[PDB]
Amino acid sequence: SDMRKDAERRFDKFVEAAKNKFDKFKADMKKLARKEAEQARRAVRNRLSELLSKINDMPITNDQKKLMSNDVLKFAAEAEKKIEALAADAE
């Protein structure tokens, strides 16, 4: 319930760290921006993974583990998309 809101915010934060770093890049280098892409996707994946662990450890029903894990997957994916768009702005 509040777990939706916490994750949606946390994942939005990730794409802002990208939005910032890409914009000063916008303001060796093509190599640099591909590195930042791989890092921020690796941050989204890692956080996804972390949340799934915490979810699977909770004493809740499977249906609930399923709703929560799918909520969290969808945001993580929405973030990979939004960040994939920023690499294209460079490339």
């Epitope: 699977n56 499977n62 249906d63 399923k66 997957l73």
Partner: antibody, heavy 120, light 107 residues
């Protein structure tokens, strides 16, 4: 291409232990969300879920097989092993492994199954 | 632990008929899944999350329901829909399947 492939003996004597092994590829038990489960089907009867294991190493077993099951994983080898103790003739069945996800809580990909006969 | 009853357990119908299989559960589940199994093959997932279609599954298949009562529908039976169909619940441990329903063809 997600594939699973069950292996083990076709024949087991009554009271002995059966050791089954699932080998898979196209996915990994190191990935968050992933699970492998075992299901069996006696000849001409219904499917019966036996066990599963998750990527965080959490396990579940069917109480109907009360204490005869051990499941375990080898992530690096992409292999899950299932051990069934004190086999009796009613355990004669086709044994299947299949892939499950915390997003699904259902099996979307199965091996072809391996047939086990309990007999002297 | 949740047990499911399928009706009928056996069924014959002609090619082109509408066929319905019901799976009532012993208590509430959030979702029902359906497997199709042909002669000496592994079960293939057919319908998941109650009404959503799996891949390589024609549109003539569909599911509905909620709570304890669910249906699988084949809207125009084909010869290759010959199989045994099982419902399956993953909402609770242990996981369980219905007893099955044999679909046979009349010609």
């Amino acid at each position: 291409q997600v594939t699973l492939r069950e292996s083990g003996p076709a024949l087991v004597k009554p009271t002995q232990t059966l050791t089954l092994t699932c080998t898979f590829s196209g996915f990994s038990l190191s990935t968050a969300g992933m699970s492998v489960g075992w299901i069996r089907q006696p000849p001409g009867k219904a499917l019966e879920w036996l066990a599963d294991i998750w990527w965080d190493d959490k396990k579940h077993y069917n109480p109907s097989l009360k204490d005869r099951l051990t499941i375990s994983k080898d992530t690096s080898a992409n292999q899950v092993v299932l051990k069934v103790t004190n086999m009796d003739p009613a355990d004669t069945a086709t044994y299947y492994c299949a892939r499950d996800m915390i997003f699904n809580f259902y099996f979307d990909v199965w091996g072809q199954g391996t047939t086990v006969t309990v007999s002297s | 632990d949740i047990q499911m009853t399928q009706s009928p357990s056996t069924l014959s119908a002609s090619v082109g008929d509408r066929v319905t299989i019901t799976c009532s559960a012993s208590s509430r589940v959030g979702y029902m899944h359906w497997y199709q199994q042909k002669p000496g093959k592994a079960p293939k997932l057919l319908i998941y999350d109650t009404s959503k279609l799996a891949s390589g599954v024609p549109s003539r298949f569909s599911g509905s329901g909620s709570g304890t009562a669910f249906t699988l529908t084949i809207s125009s039976l084909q010869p290759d829909d010959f199989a045994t169909y099982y419902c399956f619940q993953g909402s609770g441990y242990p996981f369980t399947f219905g007893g099955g329903t044999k679909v046979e063809i009349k010609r």
